[PDB]
Write a protein that binds this ligand. Structure first.
Ligand SMILES: Cc1cccc(C)c1OCC(=O)N[C@@H](Cc1ccccc1)[C@@H](O)C[C@H](Cc1ccccc1)NC(=O)[C@H](C(C)C)N1CCCNC1=O
Ligand SMILES: [Cl-]
Ligand SMILES: [Cl-]
Ligand SMILES: [Cl-]
Ligand code: NA
Lengths: 99, 99
């Protein structure tokens, strides 16, 4: 699709067998999802941005279907105010900014 | 242009006669810049990022160039770690996310 930016670019994603709404976020390096279970090993890390830092659990090789497009990569899980699809997965679905 | 996302979508902007680096961010509702002087009166606003909310100064009808594209609109100033071009100005310059 071609998504205009009058509203937040929210899409449905499928992760860990669950449907979630998430923000397509060119300003995010990483994909950050609210608390959920994911399989496999994980490693803690901190993410800091506007407002300060939160602690997240990093899971590797997680598949996510984003608006119908499959991608695999690292997903971090933690107390984010909004589910965020960041550049590590936007590249995989071929998303670009155009103007 | 068409900007891929393998690296951060950083561009040069011009505001108050000065060049600065900023992030094109589809996950930001508004445009927030690091501390600088802008003309006119400002209004209070808060913006929420990954770690909580910050207070910013909202200036309206500010002249700003984004990657060579002229715009006039709302710019907020505050303690952001990175200059952010958000959806208000991305929409004005015709940007869309495509995949
Ligand atoms: C939501 C909003 C409303 C009004 C105005 C603004 C600017 C708004 O956006 C605020 C905001 O922080 N939006 C984020 C996503 C957002 C929207 C709504 C709520 C919470 C978050 C995101 O897009 C941009 C922001 C930029 C950033 C800031 C400081 C340092 C580095 C980068 N990016 C990050 O925080 C990312 C996180 C998400 C992995 N990040 C931080 C670790 C280093 N690298 C990195 O990429
Ligand atoms: Cl990844
Ligand atoms: Cl590509
Ligand atoms: Cl505006
Ligand atoms: Na894993």
């Amino acid at each position: 699709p071609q998504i205009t930016l009058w509203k937040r670019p929210l899409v449905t994603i499928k992760i860990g067998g669950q449907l979630k709404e998430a923000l397509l976020d060119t300003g995010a390096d990483d994909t950050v999802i609210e608390e959920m279970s994911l399989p496999g090993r994980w490693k803690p890390k901190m993410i800091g941005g506007i407002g300060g830092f939160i602690k997240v659990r990093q899971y590797d090789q997680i598949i996510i279907e984003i608006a119908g497009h499959k991608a695999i990569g690292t997903v971090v899980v933690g107390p984010t105010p909004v589910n965020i699809i960041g550049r590590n997965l936007l590249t995989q679905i071929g998303a670009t900014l155009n103007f």
